[PDB]
Structures are given as structure tokens and as C-alpha cells.
Assembly symmetry: D2
Amino acid sequence: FRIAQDVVARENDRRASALKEDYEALGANLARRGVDIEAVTAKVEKFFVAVPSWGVGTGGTRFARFPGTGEPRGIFDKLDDCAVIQQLTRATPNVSLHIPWDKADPKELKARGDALGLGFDAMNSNTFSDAPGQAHSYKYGSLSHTNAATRAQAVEHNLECIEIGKAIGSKALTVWIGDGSNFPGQSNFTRAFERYLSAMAEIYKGLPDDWKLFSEHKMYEPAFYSTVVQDWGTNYLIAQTLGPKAQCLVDLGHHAPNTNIEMIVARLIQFGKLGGFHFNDSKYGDDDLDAGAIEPYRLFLVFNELVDAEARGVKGFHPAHMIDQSHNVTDPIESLINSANEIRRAYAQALLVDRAALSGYQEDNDALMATETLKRAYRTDVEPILAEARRRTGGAVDPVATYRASGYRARVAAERPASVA
Amino acid sequence: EFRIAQDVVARENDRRASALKEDYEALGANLARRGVDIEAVTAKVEKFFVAVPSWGVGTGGTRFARFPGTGEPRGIFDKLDDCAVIQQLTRATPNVSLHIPWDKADPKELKARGDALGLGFDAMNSNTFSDAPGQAHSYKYGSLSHTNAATRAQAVEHNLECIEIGKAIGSKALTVWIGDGSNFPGQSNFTRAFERYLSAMAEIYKGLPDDWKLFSEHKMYEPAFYSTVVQDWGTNYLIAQTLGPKAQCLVDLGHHAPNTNIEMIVARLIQFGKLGGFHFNDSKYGDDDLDAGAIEPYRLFLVFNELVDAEARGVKGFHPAHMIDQSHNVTDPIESLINSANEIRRAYAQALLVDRAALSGYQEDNDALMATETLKRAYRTDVEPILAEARRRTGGAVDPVATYRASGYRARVAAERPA
Amino acid sequence: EFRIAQDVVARENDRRASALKEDYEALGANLARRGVDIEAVTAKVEKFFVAVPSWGVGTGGTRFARFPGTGEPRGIFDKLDDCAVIQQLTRATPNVSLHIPWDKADPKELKARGDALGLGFDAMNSNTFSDAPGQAHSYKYGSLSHTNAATRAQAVEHNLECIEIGKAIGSKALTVWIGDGSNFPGQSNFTRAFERYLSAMAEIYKGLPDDWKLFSEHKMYEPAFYSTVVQDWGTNYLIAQTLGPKAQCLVDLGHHAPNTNIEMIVARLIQFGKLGGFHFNDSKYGDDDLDAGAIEPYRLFLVFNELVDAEARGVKGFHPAHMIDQSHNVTDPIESLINSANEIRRAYAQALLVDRAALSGYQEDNDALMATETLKRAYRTDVEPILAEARRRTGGAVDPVATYRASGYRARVAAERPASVAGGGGII
Amino acid sequence: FRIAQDVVARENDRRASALKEDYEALGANLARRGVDIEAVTAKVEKFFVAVPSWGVGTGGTRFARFPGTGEPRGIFDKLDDCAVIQQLTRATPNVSLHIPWDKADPKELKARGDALGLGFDAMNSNTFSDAPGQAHSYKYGSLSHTNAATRAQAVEHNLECIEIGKAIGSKALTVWIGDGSNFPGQSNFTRAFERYLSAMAEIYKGLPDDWKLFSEHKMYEPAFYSTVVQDWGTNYLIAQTLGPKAQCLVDLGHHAPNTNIEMIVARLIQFGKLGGFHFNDSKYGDDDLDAGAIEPYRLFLVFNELVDAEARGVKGFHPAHMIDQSHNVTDPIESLINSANEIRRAYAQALLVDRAALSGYQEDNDALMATETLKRAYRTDVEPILAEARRRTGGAVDPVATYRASGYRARVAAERPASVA
């Protein structure tokens, strides 16, 4: 146990009275609305989102990185920190690894995971940066690089990610690359995309029968003029071209200003190509901020689409959700905790929507009551539900407060040496 | 008189009184545990008012089409009758803002009708973004900043007329939003156009009563698609600062560039004493003029967080002239204004719930996570019971839209008004 | 017929003939030093055409107001007379795109008038984004994707009628742009609305002759301010792929989210054979519908770079149906359409100057600087002499707007057509 | 000379004939337009823009930095490379230094500058990152930090920058900070600004009589929710509040999407607060791309405002222009050369605008002819003017071609060791 049980118990007991009052008050209010709070809590306690191993360390910008104390030294320290998030929120049982940052003996990774009560989600390849001893640089691209040898090198890297994943229990490979151009004319849009499609087709052939290959679009950054996989349209063309095992990932902050992101989610689901959603929030670009910290309603609207799919009876829909954030000015663990909380919060609210009433207002084109039907769910404070779900599953009623009371950060700060060079 | 039968209001209130008592008492207990007296909040909420636009009671449209509903108001008198419903049921919109010449009519009759309906009059709104019948000079190429002196003079005179009308009905301010700008690079000389605007506004200011305020409203684009004279809050500040103490800036939510941090603009204008008021609506793409809070309710809350913080910081002489400015293209205008007025009080109530002492502590200690969580604890609170009880206690409806529909008001005016 | 007196055209051409010869010969020498034959470029420019929207010759407006000019066209026939002026002077707009029901009239008269004016007819345009007098079902909440079956059927029938009208006048395509969408979250179920749209379009598709095309046009927003059924090229692609071989996508410059790489979308649609055509205009904020190239001329060039690259790589079965779609709120509509058609040919001509071999080399070598400079060398070239000479040799004017103004055309039609009144837009 | 004179002479003679033909042809065309090409050329050869010392090194993103060969390390290597840009373009005689990156003995800096034929422009302070041994971190801000000692440290650093500047011939201090917040509530907008204003007042007091203090606004990055100096409005409030010696800098890529930047330039000039413009181009955010590579017309429209002011000599209008770009996928020297070229290009074209005719069309509301009057200038290919201006002043007809012919990059590659073979 990363966090002492007596601490979790103590902090839970301290807040039990208030939780009881709020939960029972909410339960009665929901009952008057025809909703069984117990049915909602039962589903909330089973909603999981993968945590990125790279999100536990402090992030930075091109201008600077301001590390906190006790920064994880490697993947094993990162898993240790991910275990804190899972123990306290019970919403992040699986961790997504990034290669080569997290490269290590697969057996040791699996053993540590099992010891901490953590599983492993989708593997993530890295061809947006150069690793030591690399025969070819990814400065001008990777999977879509003009140089055949460079693409082959990128392909082999992705195949290695699959091998590592097969050894630790992973069932998917996520591919996000920075490939693109910074100047008009620098790249031939079509040929670059063709090169990418050819390389991804090779990676696709290395997929086990029960694996998925996820491609992730991004409007810009690192490329500032054009990006090969720039939007969901190109992303759909990729997944449709590659095959049944290839699907698209939607990262909230990877879209143009004012984009209706929830619609993209709906479109991909309709055509069976929504592999998963990567959570974070943003205001300007791919800010990678804590989920729901900027636009909580948008997060709820994305979940409304995810829940409606289930309501419509979409078959074989098992998206692979993951948080992908950079924590530049907070304790990474605390941000991941509250971000996972916001995600469950939006999910819980989406479950409260009176779909029967909504379908009626939609058919009669009663726009005001339709939007108000969504708002009645979104306006509901579901914190008591989230808190009870945690209590029941061994988590903390107030995760961050408990984390702080445990003195975990100070503890790892004394155990881990800060990098000097 | 009452546009909505008092027995319908009573009936629809009693029907929901039991559940409201339950929700209000529960929220009261929760707030008490948080060191907040729900009664103090309700008391402030029932005193929060936002002006309704006379032009918002009719169905709006786009350049592609307008799809009117039934019982559309024929003139300003029908509009006042409809605005009276919004005030009667929400009790949050006691004042109506008129637009000239659309609402031109015997000011004396307007005031009489207002008093009878329990409505007051807010800021006057001039119109030099469209041509009126018999108008000598067209505003096609501008008004107050038009290159032709005679055209600017006509625009100035029109604004002065708006003032005369407002003085007769109890208005204490003139809001100036013009479409002046250009659609092509080179069409206008940015500086000369602005100089002309400033000189024209100075004439209006000269004729402004000393118990009135003059509001200028910035807009990034539309109707101008390349440049706009009063394009942003920076230019707006220059205008207000140049004109005088009685001149201030109006911030309309949907009038900013994509991703703009609007709540910061609000804070900046307050700090320099030039925030005349805020015009509410919501948007996703541009100046969509949608129902307030229908798209980004948190942003609305953040704007109110700055308004409430101004009081908390002890800012003096701060009395913003708030107004709703929306276009209702696919809903019953009355229902939208009702729920928009509600959303505005909702964000206000949540802002009142912010533990300012705690927030200040987290800000000084640079505890970003707890600081943002402190705002969220307020925002996540469902204040609907407070809004409903405030309405119930002041003569309004627990559920305004439900009561509105139960009254059959729309069917009623549809029969009294042409098709 | 000649809307503009031939003597005026000749007069204004002779007046500028000397300077043109000097500039054309100078550019010719410069291009020669660059291994380019100016005659080869002029020859292609003279053959580049873009359809003109019938509704574009009238003064446009916003939801706040409309400020009509003098001599506003009363209907399709007046509009055709005005379009004829654009074609006569620029020689770049031989075909006109009709909009129904605005231009509804006897197919025989339409065709007869076009022939007399030297105008052909391009893609038909359906209108289910507004209500017409006596209409049985309102399109307030949608049309092809409306929740009401009868409303959808009415919309389908209207579109089929557009195809019938087009078959009688020489048209070979139907363009479908609707405002269908929502203004509030929850108002529409995104997926169900799209399913309804697809099903309705499938019915329209069934009525397409074997040599006809069906074009769907995406738009991020307006009139819908929360969601739009056909919101972007991604959805547009799904439509075209679902409907069939005869269904393709139209890309309207100002219909994209801020900062979108529009030229890439063009390339993507070409790669997958679904580029139905490009609708020209320019913008700075949203769907401003401004004169092409008036705001971002380089972006216009970059779009043409993708079009010309395809036109050079032999891309078979590539005959995009280009059209101008602009709103002229503060200029004489005819003059704007004239200079817009000119800007389009300007971008095209510059794209033709790109050294494709050199560019290909810099791309393979990842020489970003020289690759971008290769495009700039073409774009920086002032091809006005080529455009003017192309017009001169084909019966057009060296300086179209100058000739238009010298002819007194506007004042003429102003004296023949009833006066128009200014007013407010759909705002109220 | 960084570049051998014989190479410059050889590559000039190689293109002399074609240049003579084009310059004469353009001179004749301009003559027919009532314009004297010589008057334009004379001004163009005198138009200068400062080069950032940090611009000659390869730039990167938060994902990676892909260095080229012969990367300059330290201000001395950087000045050596900046000298190449000046020798070949003759448009960048002054270099802007950044402290502490360029910290060195002033006498040695001044000595090296004079030897290379380079002067020193505005000083640039750095409180958006932490230097080793720093007492207080700038993680949560600097000049506007809640901690007094942190603000005092930032103020002292800026004063040290002025001291360094005084010793090498600089006459201004540019202040761009990352100060802001990533979460709603993290900062109190008004209080943070009050602290900033108070700290800048202290810096202003240390300004010599002939010095200027420039504040630079930026919408976002590194702050992803709010930024203290977020736009020109706040920037104006700063300059007007500080005093006569304080003005505002406008960096092209620091604005919200679709912003009309040329209008901002005009507004600041009208109120005497345009301290200078920082050139670069962009498509998505603060991309810091080569000037004019994305939107050359916008660059021309900005210069249309600058030239209009220059023609009349507006009170307080004496801009301190500088290039501020990041070269992530090109040879930094080549990009700076062609960027400086684009800047002079737009300047030259703005010089061609028939102001009398334009004013006439503006007064008559003839929008079509007014815009066409600008286009007639913009459509003019002024390359012959730029090339002749360089040739007449000791520069190269074709800067990049001459740079490549000289083999400079391979030369410094041999003198400077890369991190890896």
C-alpha cells in the first residue's frame, strides 16, 4: 500500500457524516426524478480510465520546466506513483506505457504492476524524438519520412512496442507522431500521407488477433504549417484503409478553435472507428490541462455522446480511454487524481440524462426543453456518488485531502534524488 | 395587471412546493455545513436584475432566413406585453432596454404601459447600422465614423434623439454599438476612421445629461468582415478614457476573438473603472447570440466570479448596467429569455458561494489545484432551489417555463396577433 | 448580344495596349531566363474558367441590414444580363450557376437567353435553407435531415425538381448546401440526424442521370450555431463515399474552422477522388464570403498549387466544378465578381509557374527552405500582363473594371430597373 | 569577413546580368506609374531589423529539438553567425542579446561586435526560466509573483540587464514574461497585474534618460489559462501607466486567431506607444515561423501602416524592430536571411503604394479601388530592388545561394563539436 490504510480510514471516517447527509439528500432528489442513485453509483464505481506513465512527472513547455520535489527517477517510480492514484480514486487500474522512456524488462514491469494492483493499457510508440544510437533522425518525419530506411526504422520501433505490450498484458498500440511540415511546399501532402499509410500497413501486420492499432490526429505542434494526421477526417481514412483492427483516438485538445468535438466522437462511433478518447482540457491549443478544469460542460457533452451510443445499442463498443495531460504547475499526482474525478463526474452526469424525455423533445423539435433536459443532469452535483463509489472500493472520500494527509510527496522527495545534469 | 393569470402561477407553484421545500432544506443544510447561510444567498439572488432587450422578444434570424413563430409581437407595445411575462415569472428582468427607431412611439404612452405592466426602462440603444425610412444619408459605408460629415452629423443627431426619448421614460444611459468598419484592406484608413468616430462621440457626450452614462460596445467583426472601428476592448478603453467620466465600456460575451479570456477583460475594465456593463448571451463560433449559459456555463460563472470579486476587493462606485442581448431563432423567444435570465442568476448565485478567504489563501500560496477546486466547489453546487425559492417569494414561478406553457400564453397572443 | 459596346472595349484596350506590350514582353523575357515559355502559360490561362453564381450579381447583406445599390436585378433574366458583362470583360466566367426557386423560370427562355448572351449553365443549386410562399412544410428545424418524414420528402422532391430544370438547360450537377443543424446541445441527436440526411440524399442520388454529379457542401456553422449536420470535410467525405461514384465534395474557402489548413483538405479529397469542386471567396473571421484573394492571396495560391499539381500529374478523371460564391455588401457586385475572377486566374497562373521538378527535388531532400522558396518564386511573379493579354486576345478587356466603368453600364441598368429599398436583415 | 569576399563577388557577377535586366524593367514599369525606383532602393538599403542572438541556434518544441551541424554555443559563436546574416543581407547590423544566455564580459562583447561589424540592440531579460543557483523560482511567476522576494529578484535581474546594455551601446530593455495561470482561480487577475505594474515601475526608475522600456503582450504559452500581459489593451495600460519611456512591442504570432494585427499597430502608433514590431509568421499560434512564409499579404498590411507613419513622421514613432523566430527544421542562418529579406520586401512594396490615390478612394468610399490600390503595390515583384540594394551595400544578390556556395555551415561544423558524431 503506497498510502497507509489507517490514513485512508481516518480521513474517510472524518468525512463520513457529511457524505451520508449529501448522498442521501441526492438520493431522494434523484428518486423524485425517477432515478435510482444506487444504479448510478454501481456503474460509476466501474468506470475506468488509463493513466499515462509520463503524466506522473512534472511537465514543461519549450520555454522551461519547473520540477517539483520527488520527481520519479524511472518507470518503476512512476508505477509507484500511479498506484497512489489508483488506490485513492479506484478509477485508474491500468497504466499506459511509453517506449523508449519506459523500456525495461517486461517481466519486471509486469511483476511490479501485479504487486501494486495495476494493469497495463495501450502501448505508446515514440518517433517524435530521437533516442541514442538511432541510425536515422526523425527531424523531418518518421513513419512518413521521405527516406525509406527511416520509415523502416520507425516501423521496427512500433513492432518492438507491440512485443513489449504482449509480454505485459497490453492489447493495443497507440501511434501519435509529429510528422508534418513548417513551410508551404516542404512536403507533398499526398505523398507524405501515402508513405504513412504504407508504414502503418506494415505495423498492422504485426498485430495479434486481439490487438488494436490506434492512430491519433492533431491539428498542429510540433508541425506548424501542416501535419500528416491533422484531423479526424484523415484519421478516419487511415483506420478505414488499414482494417478492422485500426481505429481512431480523439484527444480533446487536438482540434481547431471552436470545433464541435462531441460531434466528431458521434461520427466515429457511427462508423465504428472510435478507438478511444484521450482526456484533458484546453483553452488555446493542445494545452494538455487537467480534464474539466476549463470547460466541464464540453466534457459532459462528450460523455453524453458516449452514453447515447450505449442507449442506441451500438454493438462491440469498448473504447480505450486514457488521460493525456501535462502538469506544469501542480503536483502531478494530485492533478491526475482530480482529473480522473472530473472524468467520472461527467460520466455520472451523463448517466442521469432522462433519455426518454430527451428523445421526445428531439422528435418534436423542442430545442429549449431538449437542452434543459441535458442541463438537469449536468447541473446535478454528483460528488456524493463519486465519493461513495470510492469508499465502497477502498478509495478515499476526498482523494487529494487524503494524499496530503499521508505526506506521500515529502516521503518520495527524500527517497528520490533530483537530477543535477 | 398580470399577463399570466395569478391562479395559474399559484397552481403551478403549489404543484411543486413540496419538492422545492425538500431541495431547499437539503441545500440549506449542506451550505450550513460549509459555513454559508442560504438565507443570505437567496436574499441577494432575489435582488439581482438584468435588463431584457425589447428586440429579443420576437423571433430572430440570419442572413439566410427568418422562421417566425406564432403570435409574433407587431410593435413595441406587444413586446412590452411579452417582456412583462418574463418579469412576472422570473422576477429577474424588471427593466426593458429600447431600441430606436424600432421602438419609436409616444414615450409618454410607453412609460404608462411600463408602469401598468410593472416594467421600468434601462439603457437606450441607438441604431446607425441600418437605414430608416426617409433617411437622408445611408449608413452603408459607416455612420459616426463615415467619411461624409453630413452623415456623421445625422448619426450624432439620431443618438441625441435617443437621449430625448430616454429622458421621458426614465432611462439613464445610451448604448452605442455601430457596425462601422471595412470589408477590404485599404477601404478605410484605420486611424482617420477612429479619429472621426471619437470626434462624433465627443458631440454625443457633449449632449449627454449629467445623470446619464454613455456606453460604447466593441465587436471583433460582423457586419464588417475585415476591420471594425470599435473592434476590441483595447480600442473601447481608449474611447471611454478619451470621452470622459460618464463614458464607459460594455462587454458582450460573443463579441471576442476565438479563445479570448473574456473574464480577464472584465477584470481589467473594472480595475480601471471603465466597465459600464456586460451584455449576456452565449456562443460557440462567433457572435452567435445564443441563450446565456447554453454553451459554456462555466465561462459565465467565471465572468461572475470577477464581478463578485470586485465587491470582495472593496471596489467602489461599481454598479454595472447588465443586459441580455440574444437572438432566438429556433425557440419561443419568451421561454429563452426566461431560462437565460435564470442562467444568469444561477452563475451569480454560485459566485456568491465562493469561499473568498480560502481562495485568497490558495492564491497567495500558489496552490493552483486547491485554488481552482475552491471555485469548482461553488460552481458544482446546484443552486436551482435558491433560484426557485427566490422566485416563489417574490411573486414569480417555481418553474417559469412550465408555468408559461401551462398558461397557454403563446396560443393566446397567437390568436390576438396576425399570422 | 453585347452588354458592353464593342467600341468601348476596343477604345479602352487600345488606350492600354502600349503599356501592356511593354510589360508582357518584359515578363516574357524574365520567364524565358527562367526556362518558361510565357505563351504556354497564357494559352492555359485563357482556358481557365470558373462558374459565376446567379445570386452573386445582386447586392448582399447581413442579418443587421442590406444596403442595395442602383439598378439591382429583378430576377434571373436581369441577373443573366449582368453575368454576361462579367464574361464579356474577363472571359473567365462562361457558365452561370442557377439557384432554385430564386431563378425558377421557363427552361426554354433561360437556355435561349444564355445562348444569346454567350453563357452556359453550370451546377444547379437547391434551396432548403429558407421557406418559400405556399410551402407546405417549414425548414425551420431542418430539411433533408428534419425529424418529420413529410418535410424530408418535400425537400427531396424539391431537389429532384432542380435536377429536372437542370437537364433542360444543359446542367450536369446538383449542389446541395443546407443549414440543417442545431443551436443547442441536445436539440439534435447527431447520429440520427446524419442518418436521416444520408437516407434522403440517397433518394436524390437515384434521380441523377448517368452523366450527372451530386455535390454535398460542408460548413462549420451558420445558420446553425451549435452543430451542423454537414459540418466539415470529414463528414462530407463520409457522405460522398456512402452515396456513390457520382457523389463528390465541394470545398468552400470560408467554411472552415479558424486556422484550418484548407489546401490539405483539397489534396486529401483529390487523393481519394472526391473533390467535386472548389467554391471561391476569401475570409478573415468566418464565412465572410469576401472577394477571392482580397484577404489572403497566398492561401488562394496554395490551394491552386494543389489543383495544378494534380492537373500536372495526369490525375485522370479530374474536372472540378469550380464556382465563385461571394456576397458583395459594399461594392458594385459586377466589379467584385470581375476582380475575383481575375484573382482566381492570377493564382492559377502563378501556380503554373512553379518548377515542379525543382520542388520535387527539394521535397525529397527535405530542403524546407528551398522548397518554400520554389513556391514563392512563382507566387512573387506579377502575372497581370498574362491575365490582361489573355483577356485581350479572347475579346475581353485589358483592365475589366476600368472598361466597365467607362461603359456606364451601372447607370444604364439603374435607369431601366425599379428602385430598391434599404432595411434590416433577418435580425428582426 | 565570415564569408570570403571573392565568393560574394563571384556569386554577384554570376547574377549581375539578369539583375540588370530585371531592375531596369521594373524601373521602367515604376516610371510609367510615376514612381522613381531609385527613391525606393535608397530607403530599402537603409531599412534595418535587429537579429535575435538566440535565433541562430536551432530551435525546438516541448517534444524535441533536432540540432543541425555547427550549432553555435555561447554568444561568441552566435555573434559570428549573426555576422554572416548582416554581411550577406546588410539588413541586420544590430543584434539583440538575451540575459543570462549571453552573459559575458561587456568589454569582450563590445570588442567582438565591433570586430564583426555588429552593433547591439535592445536587451532582453529572462524571468520565464530558472538559472542554476537561483534563490527564488519563477515557476509561479516573476515580476507578478505573489512572493515579494521573488519579484525583487526579477526586478534586480532586469536592472542588471540595463547595466549590461549601457556598457555595450544598447538603449532599451525588452520585457516578455510567461507570468500567468493555467487554472481558473489560481491567480487573481487584478492583483497579479497590480504586482506587475509595481515591479515594472521599479525597473522604469533604473532607465537612463535616453532609454526605452518595452513590454510585450502574448495571449498564451507558457500560461494556458490566463496571462498577465495577454493583449495590446493590457499592454497599452502598462505603457501609459509607466511613463513616456515605456512603449509596447507587437509580436506577430502573439495574437488570438483572426485578430486584425495591422489595426493594433495603427492604434498604438496613434497613441504614441508602438515601441516596435517583432517579426515572424504563423498559422496556428505563436509558431515563430519565418516572416512572410505563411501570410505575406498580412506582413505587407502591417508595413502599410508602418510606411504611412514613416512618411509623415508621427510623434513617438521610432520603432525598434526585431526578428523573433524559432528555426526548427532549416539552417537558422538561411531562415534569418530570407526572413530579413521578406521584411524588406513588404517594406519596399508598402513604399510603392500611391497614398494620394488611396486617400482619394477612401474618402469616396470606393472600397474596390482602394483595395486594388494596395494590391497594385503588393503584386509588384520588388526582388530586383532588394537584390540591387544588397549589391550596392556589400551584400549578395542571392544571399542563400551565396551562403551555400561559401560552405560556411560545413566550416563551422568542423570548428564546433556536435553532441554526437
